[PDB]
Amino acid sequence: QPGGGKVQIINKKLDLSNVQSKCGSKDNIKHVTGGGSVQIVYKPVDLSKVTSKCGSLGNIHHKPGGGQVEVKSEKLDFKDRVQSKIGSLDNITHVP
Amino acid sequence: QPGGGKVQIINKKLDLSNVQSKCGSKDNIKHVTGGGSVQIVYKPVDLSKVTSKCGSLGNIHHKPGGGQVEVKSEKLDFKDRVQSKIGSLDNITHVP
Amino acid sequence: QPGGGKVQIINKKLDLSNVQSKCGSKDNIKHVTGGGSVQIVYKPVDLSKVTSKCGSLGNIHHKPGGGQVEVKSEKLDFKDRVQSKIGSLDNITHVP
């Protein structure tokens, strides 16, 4: 079985592949962005505990402040070029 | 069985593939954006506990502040070009 | 069985494929956006517990603030070009 001439031109920007075989796993692929991404996570956890045993205690003013997560983005320019220029492509096979 | 000439031109921007075989898994593919994405997660968890045993306690002013997650985006320009230019493509097979 | 000349021109922007075989899984594909996406999740969880044993306690003012998740988007321009230009394509097969 003689082979034939194979020509492959591959031009990808993002090629994310997962090949598994009997692999127990969690979440696979997530948060894929071709351009520009902005991700903000805001999970303040509060465990401020006030305990009072036998006795008295005054007033409680539990007033924490909040975060100020601010993002500016002005005059952004992300220009990508994954190209391939070929003047001439020949693929000739001779199997007499 | 002689082979034939194969020519492949592949131009993808996002190629996300998962191949599994007997793999127990969770969520597979999520949050795929070709352009630009903005993702904001806001989960403040509060466990502020006030406990009072045998005795007195004054007033309670439980007034926490809230977060200010702000995002600006002005004059954004994401220009991608995954191209392939070929002047001439020939694929000739001779199997006499 | 001699083969024939095959020519393939593939131009995709988003190619999301899942191939499984006896794989127990959860949610597969979700939140796929060709252009630009804005995703906001707002789950503040509150467990503020006030406990009072044998005794007295004053007034309770449980007034937390709310978040201000704000997003601006002005003059956005996402221009993609996944193209393929071929001047001439020939596929000739000779099996005498």
Author numbering:
A (entry chain B), B (entry chain A), C (entry chain C): 269 to 364
Structure paper excerpt:
Mutations in MAPT, the microtubule-associated protein tau gene, give rise to cases of frontotemporal dementia and parkinsonism linked to chromosome 17 (FTDP-17) with abundant filamentous tau inclusions in brain cells. Missense mutations of residue P301, which are the most common MAPT mutations associated with FTDP-17, give rise to the assembly of mutant four-repeat tau into filamentous inclusions, in the absence of extracellular deposits. The other three isoforms lack exon 10 expression and have three repeats (3R). These repeats and adjoining sequences constitute the microtubule-binding domains of tau. Part of this sequence also forms the core of assembled tau in neurodegenerative diseases, indicating that the physiological function of microtubule binding and the pathological assembly into amyloid filaments are mutually exclusive.
By cryo-EM, type I filaments comprised approximately 64% and type II filaments around 36% of tau filaments. In type II P301T tau filaments, the core spans residues N269-P364 and adopts a three-lobed fold resembling that of P301L tau filaments. This fold also consists of a stem and two hairpin-like arms, but it is shorter than the P301L fold at the C-terminus. In the stem, the N-terminal segment (residues 271–281) is shifted by two residues relative to the C-terminal segment (residues 343–364), forming an interface resembling that between these segments in the P301S tau filament fold of PS19 transgenic mice. In the short arm, the opposite sides of the hairpin-like structure of type II P301T filaments have conformations resembling those of P301L tau filaments, but they are shifted relative to each other by two residues. These differences correlate with a local conformational difference around the mutation site at residue 301, the cryo-EM density of which is consistent with that of threonine. The side chain of T301 fits inside the turn formed by the glycine triplet (residues 302–304) and hydrogen bonds with S305. Compared to L301, T301 is located on the other side of the side chain of S305.
